[PDB]
Design a protein around this nucleic acid. Sequence first.
RNA 1: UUUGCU
RNA 2: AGAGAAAUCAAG
Lengths: 587, 102, 621
Amino acid sequence: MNLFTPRSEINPTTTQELLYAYTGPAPVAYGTRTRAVLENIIRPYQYFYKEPNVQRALDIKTGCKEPEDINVEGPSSGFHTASVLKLADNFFRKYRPAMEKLKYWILVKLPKLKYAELSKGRQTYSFIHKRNLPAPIALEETVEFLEQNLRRKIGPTLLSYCQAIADVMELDETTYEGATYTIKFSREELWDQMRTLNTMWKHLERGRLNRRTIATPSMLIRGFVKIVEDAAKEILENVPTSGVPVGGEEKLAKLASKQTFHTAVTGELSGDQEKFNECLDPDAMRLMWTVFLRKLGCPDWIMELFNIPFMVFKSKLADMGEGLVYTKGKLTDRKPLGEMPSEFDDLVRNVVGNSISCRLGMFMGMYNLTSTLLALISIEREELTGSHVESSDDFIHFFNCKTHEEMFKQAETLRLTLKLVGINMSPSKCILISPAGIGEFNSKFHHRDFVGNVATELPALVPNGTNPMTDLAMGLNVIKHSVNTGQMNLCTGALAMRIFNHAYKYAYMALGVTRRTRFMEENAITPLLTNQGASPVHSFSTMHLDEVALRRHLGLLDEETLRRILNPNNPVTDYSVPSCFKYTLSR
Amino acid sequence: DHAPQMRLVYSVRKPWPISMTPSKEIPLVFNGTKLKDTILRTRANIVVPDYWSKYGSQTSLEVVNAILYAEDLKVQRFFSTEWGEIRYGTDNIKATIDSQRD
Amino acid sequence: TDRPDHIDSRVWELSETQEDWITQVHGHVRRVVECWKYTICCLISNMHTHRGAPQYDVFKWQDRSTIEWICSKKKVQYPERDTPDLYDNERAVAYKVLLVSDLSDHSPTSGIYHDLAFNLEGEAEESCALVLRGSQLQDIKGFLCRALEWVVSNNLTQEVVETISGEAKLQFSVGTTFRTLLKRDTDWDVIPTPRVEPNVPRIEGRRWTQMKKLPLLKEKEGPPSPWRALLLGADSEYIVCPPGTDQEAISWIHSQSEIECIRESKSTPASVITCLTSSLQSFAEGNPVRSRIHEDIIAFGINKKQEKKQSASSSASGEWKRAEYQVEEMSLPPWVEEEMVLLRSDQEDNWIELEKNAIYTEVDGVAEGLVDKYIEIVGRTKVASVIEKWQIAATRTFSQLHTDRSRITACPIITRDPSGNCQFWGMVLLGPHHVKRDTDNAPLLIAEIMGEDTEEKYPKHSVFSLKVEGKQFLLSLKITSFSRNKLYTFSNIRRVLIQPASIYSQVVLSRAAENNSLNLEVNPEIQLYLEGAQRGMTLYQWVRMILCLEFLMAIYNNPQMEGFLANMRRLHMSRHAMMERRQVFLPFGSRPEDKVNECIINNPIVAYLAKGWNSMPNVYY
RNA sequence: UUUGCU
RNA sequence: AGAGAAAUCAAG
Ligand SMILES: [Mg+2]
């Protein structure tokens, strides 16, 4: 580790890039996820009261509590209603133009949203076929079920789809005829299918010792989630305290550039949030949204539309999974919770078939932007006279006070406000440097006026697998995006180009002695393109140009070969030219 | 869409990777190499595009320029650009109103 | 009641006497949008003369007598209600400017005039891109952007949207039963209205304690960790064979070979060697695939899961208990330092042969020069050879995992020197795999040529003695089960070259910027915290050691390493801050060293990094 | 299923 | 036997 600590030429901050082993395989979760899911579901209830009383907390519907019950020493699971209201009001007042842009989006853009984009989601669990399916298939079958049970035609707009869902929720019995079976749902069964969340291992997650799961909602409630998340994105992109989803370059550099009169105490606090998703209450988020919309003069139906998904999540049913593992000396058996004593027996009362019903806490990957907004509203107070940037979990705060006592008071106030809204900053992962100038945030390491952007995942410098021209264009585009983003300078950019070029040439049998090279040698077919074996034509300053045009401008391609390979009548067939090499693979 | 990324090496090395519409221009067997498969869109080996670049029906030069015009513009712009030393470290309304008055 | 800054004074004053805005709902907004329409017409009409006369004639806010006179001059007639805003003489067509929230909602309407439809964001209807020029569209877009900025800055979005589009309608509603279902797990209604006075209380917090000294990581006790990577590292060797194809080299190896077991491992019995030679022979005679043999049963765990099932069932007399797992703690083994020393040993050939890019600009030349110098620095090292070996082995083994197969497949590890001589690092035999998922662990029998054997380092390997042309070699056999994803990741293990390249380039460019001249042939002294005799090293040696350590980390990447590095970045930053005479302050009950120590269990590379951290000073003055 | 990335 | 880490593969 001392090898990564240079103290002569560069700083340890510069070598922060050496503390990533992403060039190796990412850990993959193994076996049943029931233990992790149950731990995530139970964490909120233990933290609700200062002394863990899970049985008492399991009866609490809304996770609101008084400031006395807020734990200033360990994680807290609830929120303060009055504090949330006042903080939301302050946030609305301070960023009024952002709220006006949100109003413009609601009045103009929201009604014209199409639910076709709803087919871009993750693997959805079909409440008809009872298994995970690709998003387009689940959307298709759900829409067909809606048409069958409503005797009407769902409009192309997302609002129409949500209204259709709300209407079909009014039928005591619903039927789906599909080839040929007739699935019948009662109102309670369809409600359970709508509110049930499906948990899945978050495969290929780095920087974590323990694997954690994520949740996906049913296709029935995905429209409301999309509406709410789009509104959250619209409000966030116009707020200077947000680090997502837009580029963090400007966000982090803007605060790094700021200075003072060399007389005020300046501090930089970098931190993360402990159990971020296992402490937030959907009720707090929907209350914040209601405050925003009401102070914005929005109509009642908009407020109902925004609130519905949060209530549905509040009445969720988390899928337990395969079950907890029990041994019999040397055997192994996965059994559902409640069959035998375990660590989560307190939750046995909440078991509903193979699903566990929980009210507090959240699951990762569902309401990211709303969670970020909730974190942001809590920073708008009179005491907190300092800059703040937050990305879901990570956060960086800049304090500019008159004395160290004021700075520490402001830091503690920030911690306590985050507790107030239901977010606990991990004390072990929060570090404050004074004077300011050194910090870390969203894998960007800032030192004085140099912000080193370190990629969280090194680019997979290999062809995408579509076809030679498309693959080359996409790979060069990826390298250029990584370079101009600051994650790779000129030398490492050229090195990445060389590595990708070697991999790309190998993938198409153009490097050594293969069938392709043998054929081109026997028939004296000179290699004129990179995928054929020709020396690379792109460079550091020419990753945005097409191979064919660039070669033609350089004379490396002649009119005869150009007319031969670009002929549209060739029986073979992103800004790559449609040449004869733009073929398609069989399977 | 990581599956195509991992499958490329095996996909290309398969016996009949390329899937192409049947055609008579491509010879069935050229100099000992069986380029096409007679069973249906048919299949062909990766050497077919290389073969086309040497023995293929040429389209008109005008077609070539039209297809390449968009990208050739960017190439010309870059090579015509000049790179400096590298460092280390109201009237419209008036006309309308006057015209209306006229 | 004032004039918006983006509307000219003359237009405002003119519109003041055109309509009874006071008696119109949202009169100010109506007047403002009408002024926008007039200004759009003016932008269209500016500096456009047809045959010496204006190309566009504006009928907006002009007397009906004059408008009708102009229309008669053009032999056209329009009603009072459907009076077009503009008339293009060149095109001899009447137009009626329109503003709409969304362009798609617009319709052609009647045929008396083509509708120039635009949205508040400055975009125009697809038809407008034809009639109007590029400059006209750009000017209108800029003006409407300014107008939208004024709208948002004055909280008039709803009024404008109502004025141009119409009135919003009830686009959503929920029945009583759905409301009943929703109000099942919450104290509030669909629209939460908790009647409580908004106010943020003042909670009693804690004090932020200063971190005066850096923490010490916990070094675990226990058996030294053995080599657990897929292939070998510094102990990798190869047999030199005459130039030729893989089959020819394997036939040459098989012809002159006396494989005899030197050290049998009870985890990989020596008998399994028969499964290797049989494949080696099979690959020699053309086909790499091969039918199973008796020994294969114990080589790839054939019909083993059922065996354990039956064995456990026969002796399971008891009661069920919660499955508790325990990771066996292990200490730092002494072979990590030896591996690091050996990995940076100089070689003869350069093992990083990557083609150069096409230098066009001076920047391209500088980048290629930096990359070439880096390749020269790290090219002739054993770590590069091991990286090439790992890449070739992973690629050859992963290329055979895309189909279900019940027969043994042989995937040799052969690399060719620039003189063409083959180099046999070893072989990988793929047992019968029937992959139905991706991450399923395929069974492998990995034979590798090893330079030196240590029982404490390779407890599960079986070491045999190979003899070729008199020369003696050691051959280690390991029965492994490896995931497809890891094999694919290692198929491009060449990416390990980027991080040390980044550090080297950063150092060189920092020197160049300090001197304003790029001197590529430079290697300064990087002062570090070393054993004590030496206080630093040149840039090239430092880069080589960084490459070796990064390769080891990549080969030993796993959840422990991930967590250790993720939680060690914080302590690295804290040390850097302490170096610059800054103060590090922590919240109540904070111990980052706990988050780091959580991830020090088995990994030998993590233990090496932790020991290196402990060696450094923890107090700065 | 035939095998050549320093 | 083995890979591995909180529990899966070692066929179905
Ligand atoms: Mg952070």
